[PDB]
mmCIF file of all heavy atoms in Angstrom:
data_model
loop_
_atom_site.group_PDB
_atom_site.id
_atom_site.type_symbol
_atom_site.label_atom_id
_atom_site.label_comp_id
_atom_site.label_asym_id
_atom_site.label_seq_id
_atom_site.Cartn_x
_atom_site.Cartn_y
_atom_site.Cartn_z
ATOM 1 N N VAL A 9 0.275 3.501 11.186
ATOM 2 C CA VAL A 9 1.390 2.579 11.062
ATOM 3 C C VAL A 9 2.451 3.480 10.439
ATOM 4 O O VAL A 9 2.139 4.532 9.860
ATOM 5 C CB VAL A 9 1.062 1.376 10.160
ATOM 6 C CG1 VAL A 9 0.569 1.837 8.793
ATOM 7 C CG2 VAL A 9 2.276 0.526 10.011
ATOM 8 N N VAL A 10 3.706 3.092 10.550
ATOM 9 C CA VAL A 10 4.760 3.934 10.022
ATOM 10 C C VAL A 10 5.611 3.135 9.049
ATOM 11 O O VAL A 10 5.813 1.926 9.240
ATOM 12 C CB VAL A 10 5.558 4.489 11.220
ATOM 13 C CG1 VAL A 10 6.789 3.654 11.478
ATOM 14 C CG2 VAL A 10 5.809 5.933 11.026
ATOM 15 N N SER A 11 6.106 3.800 8.002
ATOM 16 C CA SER A 11 6.872 3.097 6.982
ATOM 17 C C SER A 11 8.062 3.850 6.403
ATOM 18 O O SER A 11 8.013 5.066 6.219
ATOM 19 C CB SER A 11 5.932 2.695 5.825
ATOM 20 O OG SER A 11 6.616 1.875 4.897
ATOM 21 N N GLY A 12 9.124 3.109 6.098
ATOM 22 C CA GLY A 12 10.311 3.716 5.510
ATOM 23 C C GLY A 12 10.976 4.809 6.335
ATOM 24 O O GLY A 12 11.671 5.665 5.787
ATOM 25 N N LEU A 13 10.773 4.782 7.650
ATOM 26 C CA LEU A 13 11.374 5.783 8.536
ATOM 27 C C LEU A 13 12.558 5.232 9.325
ATOM 28 O O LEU A 13 12.580 4.053 9.700
ATOM 29 C CB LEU A 13 10.339 6.293 9.532
ATOM 30 C CG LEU A 13 9.028 6.878 9.006
ATOM 31 C CD1 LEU A 13 8.261 7.461 10.217
ATOM 32 C CD2 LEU A 13 9.284 7.988 7.981
ATOM 33 N N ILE A 36 0.188 -3.488 10.251
ATOM 34 C CA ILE A 36 -1.115 -3.050 9.767
ATOM 35 C C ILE A 36 -2.194 -3.989 10.295
ATOM 36 O O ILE A 36 -2.134 -5.190 10.072
ATOM 37 C CB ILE A 36 -1.162 -3.052 8.224
ATOM 38 C CG1 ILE A 36 -0.213 -1.987 7.681
ATOM 39 C CG2 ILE A 36 -2.593 -2.818 7.731
ATOM 40 C CD1 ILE A 36 -0.203 -1.899 6.180
ATOM 41 N N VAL A 43 -1.173 5.308 6.779
ATOM 42 C CA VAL A 43 0.164 4.762 6.632
ATOM 43 C C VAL A 43 1.029 6.023 6.444
ATOM 44 O O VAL A 43 0.875 6.742 5.449
ATOM 45 C CB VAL A 43 0.302 3.842 5.395
ATOM 46 C CG1 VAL A 43 1.751 3.348 5.266
ATOM 47 C CG2 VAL A 43 -0.627 2.642 5.523
ATOM 48 N N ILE A 44 1.891 6.306 7.424
ATOM 49 C CA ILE A 44 2.777 7.465 7.373
ATOM 50 C C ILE A 44 4.093 6.998 6.803
ATOM 51 O O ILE A 44 4.768 6.159 7.370
ATOM 52 C CB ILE A 44 2.986 8.089 8.772
ATOM 53 C CG1 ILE A 44 1.880 9.096 9.052
ATOM 54 C CG2 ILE A 44 4.305 8.879 8.818
ATOM 55 C CD1 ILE A 44 0.487 8.579 8.902
ATOM 56 N N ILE A 45 4.468 7.567 5.670
ATOM 57 C CA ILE A 45 5.681 7.132 5.022
ATOM 58 C C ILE A 45 6.585 8.292 4.592
ATOM 59 O O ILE A 45 6.113 9.379 4.266
ATOM 60 C CB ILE A 45 5.275 6.255 3.797
ATOM 61 C CG1 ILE A 45 6.495 5.565 3.194
ATOM 62 C CG2 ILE A 45 4.519 7.124 2.760
ATOM 63 C CD1 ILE A 45 6.109 4.447 2.195
ATOM 64 N N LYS A 46 7.888 8.040 4.581
ATOM 65 C CA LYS A 46 8.871 9.035 4.173
ATOM 66 C C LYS A 46 8.730 9.360 2.685
ATOM 67 O O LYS A 46 8.619 8.460 1.866
ATOM 68 C CB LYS A 46 10.279 8.498 4.443
ATOM 69 C CG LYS A 46 11.400 9.525 4.276
ATOM 70 C CD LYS A 46 11.422 10.504 5.429
ATOM 71 C CE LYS A 46 12.266 11.750 5.107
ATOM 72 N NZ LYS A 46 13.723 11.431 5.017
ATOM 73 N N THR A 47 8.710 10.646 2.332
ATOM 74 C CA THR A 47 8.635 11.035 0.918
ATOM 75 C C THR A 47 9.656 12.125 0.621
ATOM 76 O O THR A 47 10.206 12.728 1.537
ATOM 77 C CB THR A 47 7.257 11.628 0.495
ATOM 78 O OG1 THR A 47 7.083 12.917 1.101
ATOM 79 C CG2 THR A 47 6.106 10.688 0.874
ATOM 80 N N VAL A 52 6.635 11.764 -3.171
ATOM 81 C CA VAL A 52 6.911 10.485 -3.796
ATOM 82 C C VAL A 52 7.669 9.662 -2.759
ATOM 83 O O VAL A 52 8.642 10.131 -2.152
ATOM 84 C CB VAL A 52 7.783 10.685 -5.069
ATOM 85 C CG1 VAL A 52 8.415 9.380 -5.496
ATOM 86 C CG2 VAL A 52 6.914 11.242 -6.191
ATOM 87 N N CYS A 53 7.225 8.431 -2.556
ATOM 88 C CA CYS A 53 7.857 7.551 -1.571
ATOM 89 C C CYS A 53 8.516 6.357 -2.220
ATOM 90 O O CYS A 53 8.449 6.175 -3.422
ATOM 91 C CB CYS A 53 6.809 7.022 -0.581
ATOM 92 S SG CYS A 53 5.568 5.912 -1.349
ATOM 93 N N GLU A 54 9.140 5.547 -1.377
ATOM 94 C CA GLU A 54 9.813 4.312 -1.749
ATOM 95 C C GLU A 54 8.727 3.217 -1.687
ATOM 96 O O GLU A 54 7.802 3.312 -0.878
ATOM 97 C CB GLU A 54 10.911 4.022 -0.707
ATOM 98 C CG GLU A 54 11.990 3.031 -1.102
ATOM 99 C CD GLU A 54 13.037 3.606 -2.059
ATOM 100 O OE1 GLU A 54 13.038 4.831 -2.297
ATOM 101 O OE2 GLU A 54 13.873 2.820 -2.565
ATOM 102 N N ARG A 55 8.832 2.199 -2.543
ATOM 103 C CA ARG A 55 7.874 1.086 -2.559
ATOM 104 C C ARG A 55 8.094 0.147 -1.368
ATOM 105 O O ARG A 55 9.110 -0.531 -1.296
ATOM 106 C CB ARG A 55 8.002 0.280 -3.876
ATOM 107 C CG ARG A 55 7.463 0.998 -5.098
ATOM 108 C CD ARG A 55 7.460 0.131 -6.343
ATOM 109 N NE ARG A 55 6.480 0.626 -7.300
ATOM 110 C CZ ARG A 55 6.128 0.008 -8.426
ATOM 111 N NH1 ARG A 55 6.682 -1.147 -8.753
ATOM 112 N NH2 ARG A 55 5.215 0.553 -9.227
ATOM 113 N N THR A 56 7.164 0.121 -0.423
ATOM 114 C CA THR A 56 7.307 -0.765 0.733
ATOM 115 C C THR A 56 6.046 -1.620 0.858
ATOM 116 O O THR A 56 5.023 -1.316 0.257
ATOM 117 C CB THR A 56 7.475 0.018 2.070
ATOM 118 O OG1 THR A 56 6.297 0.786 2.304
ATOM 119 C CG2 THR A 56 8.698 0.940 2.031
ATOM 120 N N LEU A 57 6.123 -2.672 1.660
ATOM 121 C CA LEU A 57 4.988 -3.556 1.866
ATOM 122 C C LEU A 57 3.780 -2.796 2.388
ATOM 123 O O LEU A 57 2.654 -2.964 1.889
ATOM 124 C CB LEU A 57 5.364 -4.660 2.855
ATOM 125 C CG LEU A 57 4.245 -5.636 3.211
ATOM 126 C CD1 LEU A 57 3.811 -6.410 1.950
ATOM 127 C CD2 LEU A 57 4.746 -6.587 4.300
ATOM 128 N N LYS A 58 4.010 -1.953 3.393
ATOM 129 C CA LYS A 58 2.926 -1.183 3.984
ATOM 130 C C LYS A 58 2.298 -0.224 2.997
ATOM 131 O O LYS A 58 1.091 0.027 3.037
ATOM 132 C CB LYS A 58 3.422 -0.438 5.222
ATOM 133 C CG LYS A 58 3.581 -1.379 6.413
ATOM 134 C CD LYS A 58 4.333 -0.741 7.567
ATOM 135 C CE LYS A 58 4.419 -1.677 8.761
ATOM 136 N NZ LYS A 58 5.484 -1.252 9.739
ATOM 137 N N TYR A 59 3.111 0.304 2.088
ATOM 138 C CA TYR A 59 2.599 1.223 1.080
ATOM 139 C C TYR A 59 1.608 0.447 0.206
ATOM 140 O O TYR A 59 0.470 0.876 0.007
ATOM 141 C CB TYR A 59 3.784 1.777 0.274
ATOM 142 C CG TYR A 59 3.452 2.428 -1.044
ATOM 143 C CD1 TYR A 59 2.895 3.690 -1.111
ATOM 144 C CD2 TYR A 59 3.765 1.775 -2.246
ATOM 145 C CE1 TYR A 59 2.663 4.311 -2.370
ATOM 146 C CE2 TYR A 59 3.541 2.364 -3.470
ATOM 147 C CZ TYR A 59 3.002 3.631 -3.537
ATOM 148 O OH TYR A 59 2.881 4.210 -4.776
ATOM 149 N N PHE A 60 2.022 -0.716 -0.284
ATOM 150 C CA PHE A 60 1.135 -1.538 -1.128
ATOM 151 C C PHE A 60 -0.094 -1.998 -0.352
ATOM 152 O O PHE A 60 -1.234 -1.907 -0.846
ATOM 153 C CB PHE A 60 1.901 -2.740 -1.681
ATOM 154 C CG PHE A 60 2.910 -2.373 -2.714
ATOM 155 C CD1 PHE A 60 4.271 -2.598 -2.492
ATOM 156 C CD2 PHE A 60 2.503 -1.788 -3.924
ATOM 157 C CE1 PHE A 60 5.225 -2.250 -3.461
ATOM 158 C CE2 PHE A 60 3.440 -1.435 -4.900
ATOM 159 C CZ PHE A 60 4.803 -1.662 -4.676
ATOM 160 N N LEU A 61 0.124 -2.485 0.875
ATOM 161 C CA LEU A 61 -1.006 -2.903 1.719
ATOM 162 C C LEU A 61 -1.893 -1.696 1.947
ATOM 163 O O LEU A 61 -3.125 -1.794 1.923
ATOM 164 C CB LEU A 61 -0.512 -3.425 3.070
ATOM 165 C CG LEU A 61 -0.493 -4.938 3.289
ATOM 166 C CD1 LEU A 61 -1.119 -5.669 2.129
ATOM 167 C CD2 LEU A 61 0.895 -5.385 3.539
ATOM 168 N N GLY A 62 -1.266 -0.541 2.171
ATOM 169 C CA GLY A 62 -2.036 0.684 2.385
ATOM 170 C C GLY A 62 -2.959 1.010 1.208
ATOM 171 O O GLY A 62 -4.181 1.234 1.378
ATOM 172 N N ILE A 63 -2.391 1.034 0.003
ATOM 173 C CA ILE A 63 -3.196 1.319 -1.193
ATOM 174 C C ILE A 63 -4.266 0.232 -1.400
ATOM 175 O O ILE A 63 -5.444 0.542 -1.652
ATOM 176 C CB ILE A 63 -2.316 1.408 -2.465
ATOM 177 C CG1 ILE A 63 -1.298 2.542 -2.316
ATOM 178 C CG2 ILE A 63 -3.193 1.663 -3.686
ATOM 179 C CD1 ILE A 63 -0.420 2.747 -3.557
ATOM 180 N N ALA A 64 -3.858 -1.031 -1.293
ATOM 181 C CA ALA A 64 -4.803 -2.155 -1.462
ATOM 182 C C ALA A 64 -6.044 -1.920 -0.612
ATOM 183 O O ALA A 64 -7.165 -2.179 -1.057
ATOM 184 C CB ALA A 64 -4.137 -3.532 -1.062
ATOM 185 N N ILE A 69 -2.490 7.376 2.695
ATOM 186 C CA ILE A 69 -1.028 7.215 2.679
ATOM 187 C C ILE A 69 -0.547 8.650 2.840
ATOM 188 O O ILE A 69 -0.772 9.484 1.960
ATOM 189 C CB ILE A 69 -0.481 6.621 1.358
ATOM 190 C CG1 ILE A 69 -1.308 5.398 0.907
ATOM 191 C CG2 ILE A 69 0.950 6.177 1.575
ATOM 192 C CD1 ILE A 69 -1.400 4.281 1.933
ATOM 193 N N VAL A 70 0.114 8.921 3.973
ATOM 194 C CA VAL A 70 0.555 10.268 4.343
ATOM 195 C C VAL A 70 2.064 10.443 4.528
ATOM 196 O O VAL A 70 2.738 9.621 5.168
ATOM 197 C CB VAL A 70 -0.149 10.693 5.650
ATOM 198 C CG1 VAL A 70 -0.037 12.221 5.863
ATOM 199 C CG2 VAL A 70 -1.597 10.215 5.623
ATOM 200 N N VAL A 92 0.402 11.033 -0.088
ATOM 201 C CA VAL A 92 1.423 10.555 -1.029
ATOM 202 C C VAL A 92 0.816 10.495 -2.449
ATOM 203 O O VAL A 92 -0.312 10.018 -2.654
ATOM 204 C CB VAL A 92 1.978 9.157 -0.573
ATOM 205 C CG1 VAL A 92 2.894 8.540 -1.672
ATOM 206 C CG2 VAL A 92 2.784 9.331 0.748
ATOM 207 N N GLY A 94 2.641 9.209 -5.173
ATOM 208 C CA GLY A 94 3.155 8.080 -5.912
ATOM 209 C C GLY A 94 4.443 7.595 -5.296
ATOM 210 O O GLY A 94 4.859 8.076 -4.244
ATOM 211 N N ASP A 95 5.077 6.630 -5.953
ATOM 212 C CA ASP A 95 6.323 6.078 -5.465
ATOM 213 C C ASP A 95 7.443 6.340 -6.471
ATOM 214 O O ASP A 95 7.207 6.883 -7.553
ATOM 215 C CB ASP A 95 6.164 4.568 -5.195
ATOM 216 C CG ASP A 95 5.758 3.790 -6.436
ATOM 217 O OD1 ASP A 95 6.520 3.820 -7.420
ATOM 218 O OD2 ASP A 95 4.685 3.153 -6.426
ATOM 219 N N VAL A 96 8.660 5.958 -6.099
ATOM 220 C CA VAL A 96 9.844 6.161 -6.924
ATOM 221 C C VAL A 96 9.732 5.642 -8.366
ATOM 222 O O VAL A 96 10.480 6.089 -9.255
ATOM 223 C CB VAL A 96 11.096 5.541 -6.229
ATOM 224 C CG1 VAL A 96 10.883 4.046 -5.965
ATOM 225 C CG2 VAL A 96 12.331 5.762 -7.087
ATOM 226 N N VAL A 97 8.804 4.716 -8.615
ATOM 227 C CA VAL A 97 8.628 4.204 -9.973
ATOM 228 C C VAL A 97 7.565 4.986 -10.745
ATOM 229 O O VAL A 97 7.775 5.353 -11.897
ATOM 230 C CB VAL A 97 8.238 2.702 -9.985
ATOM 231 C CG1 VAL A 97 7.923 2.277 -11.404
ATOM 232 C CG2 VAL A 97 9.385 1.835 -9.420
ATOM 233 N N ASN A 127 12.013 -9.964 -3.167
ATOM 234 C CA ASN A 127 11.717 -8.927 -2.175
ATOM 235 C C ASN A 127 10.876 -9.358 -0.969
ATOM 236 O O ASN A 127 11.423 -9.694 0.084
ATOM 237 C CB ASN A 127 11.047 -7.726 -2.860
ATOM 238 C CG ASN A 127 11.237 -6.416 -2.086
ATOM 239 O OD1 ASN A 127 11.006 -6.355 -0.877
ATOM 240 N ND2 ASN A 127 11.649 -5.364 -2.789
ATOM 241 N N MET A 128 9.551 -9.344 -1.121
ATOM 242 C CA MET A 128 8.647 -9.703 -0.025
ATOM 243 C C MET A 128 8.230 -11.174 0.022
ATOM 244 O O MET A 128 8.351 -11.894 -0.971
ATOM 245 C CB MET A 128 7.407 -8.782 -0.045
ATOM 246 C CG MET A 128 7.029 -8.210 -1.416
ATOM 247 S SD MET A 128 6.099 -6.632 -1.313
ATOM 248 C CE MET A 128 7.448 -5.379 -1.350
ATOM 249 N N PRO A 129 7.741 -11.637 1.191
ATOM 250 C CA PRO A 129 7.294 -13.015 1.431
ATOM 251 C C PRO A 129 6.021 -13.407 0.683
ATOM 252 O O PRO A 129 5.129 -12.580 0.480
ATOM 253 C CB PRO A 129 7.103 -13.054 2.944
ATOM 254 C CG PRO A 129 6.632 -11.673 3.245
ATOM 255 C CD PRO A 129 7.563 -10.820 2.408
ATOM 256 N N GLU A 132 2.623 -12.377 2.365
ATOM 257 C CA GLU A 132 2.102 -11.022 2.279
ATOM 258 C C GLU A 132 1.641 -10.662 0.864
ATOM 259 O O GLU A 132 0.766 -9.814 0.688
ATOM 260 C CB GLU A 132 3.163 -10.031 2.770
ATOM 261 C CG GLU A 132 3.516 -10.198 4.250
ATOM 262 C CD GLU A 132 2.354 -9.863 5.182
ATOM 263 O OE1 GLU A 132 1.372 -9.241 4.719
ATOM 264 O OE2 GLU A 132 2.426 -10.213 6.378
ATOM 265 N N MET A 136 -2.049 -9.232 -0.032
ATOM 266 C CA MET A 136 -2.243 -8.094 -0.929
ATOM 267 C C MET A 136 -3.272 -8.487 -2.001
ATOM 268 O O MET A 136 -4.234 -7.766 -2.256
ATOM 269 C CB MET A 136 -0.920 -7.769 -1.606
ATOM 270 C CG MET A 136 -0.488 -6.328 -1.618
ATOM 271 S SD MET A 136 1.100 -6.267 -2.502
ATOM 272 C CE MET A 136 2.262 -6.185 -1.144
ATOM 273 N N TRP A 169 5.850 -10.649 -11.057
ATOM 274 C CA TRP A 169 5.097 -10.120 -9.936
ATOM 275 C C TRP A 169 4.972 -8.593 -9.964
ATOM 276 O O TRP A 169 4.009 -8.034 -9.411
ATOM 277 C CB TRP A 169 5.713 -10.623 -8.632
ATOM 278 C CG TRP A 169 6.933 -9.923 -8.216
ATOM 279 C CD1 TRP A 169 8.071 -9.728 -8.949
ATOM 280 C CD2 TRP A 169 7.180 -9.357 -6.927
ATOM 281 N NE1 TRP A 169 9.016 -9.073 -8.187
ATOM 282 C CE2 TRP A 169 8.493 -8.837 -6.941
ATOM 283 C CE3 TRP A 169 6.419 -9.245 -5.753
ATOM 284 C CZ2 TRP A 169 9.059 -8.213 -5.827
ATOM 285 C CZ3 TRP A 169 6.985 -8.626 -4.645
ATOM 286 C CH2 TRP A 169 8.291 -8.120 -4.691
ATOM 287 N N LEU A 173 2.491 -5.080 -8.351
ATOM 288 C CA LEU A 173 2.934 -3.843 -7.717
ATOM 289 C C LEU A 173 2.563 -2.611 -8.526
ATOM 290 O O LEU A 173 2.098 -1.614 -7.982
ATOM 291 C CB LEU A 173 4.444 -3.902 -7.465
ATOM 292 C CG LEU A 173 4.930 -5.171 -6.738
ATOM 293 C CD1 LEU A 173 6.395 -5.010 -6.356
ATOM 294 C CD2 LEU A 173 4.113 -5.424 -5.495
ATOM 295 N N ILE A 176 -1.213 -2.058 -8.334
ATOM 296 C CA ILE A 176 -1.643 -1.429 -7.086
ATOM 297 C C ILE A 176 -1.147 0.014 -7.038
ATOM 298 O O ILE A 176 -1.926 0.917 -6.739
ATOM 299 C CB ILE A 176 -1.132 -2.185 -5.845
ATOM 300 C CG1 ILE A 176 -1.847 -3.552 -5.751
ATOM 301 C CG2 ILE A 176 -1.403 -1.339 -4.566
ATOM 302 C CD1 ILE A 176 -1.412 -4.391 -4.599
ATOM 303 N N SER A 177 0.128 0.232 -7.364
ATOM 304 C CA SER A 177 0.709 1.588 -7.327
ATOM 305 C C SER A 177 -0.117 2.654 -8.064
ATOM 306 O O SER A 177 -0.166 3.788 -7.628
ATOM 307 C CB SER A 177 2.155 1.589 -7.856
ATOM 308 O OG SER A 177 2.192 1.362 -9.257
#
Side-chain angles (χ1 to χ4, degrees):
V9 55
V10 97
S11 187
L13 305 187
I36 293 181
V43 178
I44 273 54
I45 189 167
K46 190 74 195 291
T47 70
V52 163
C53 66
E54 197 77 9
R55 288 186 157 188
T56 63
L57 178 63
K58 284 168 177 163
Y59 163 76
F60 289 117
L61 257 354
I63 299 183
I69 314 304
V70 196
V92 171
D95 59 60
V96 58
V97 174
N127 204 311
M128 27 205 90
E132 296 294 345
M136 228 181 260
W169 78 306
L173 309 189
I176 291 179
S177 70

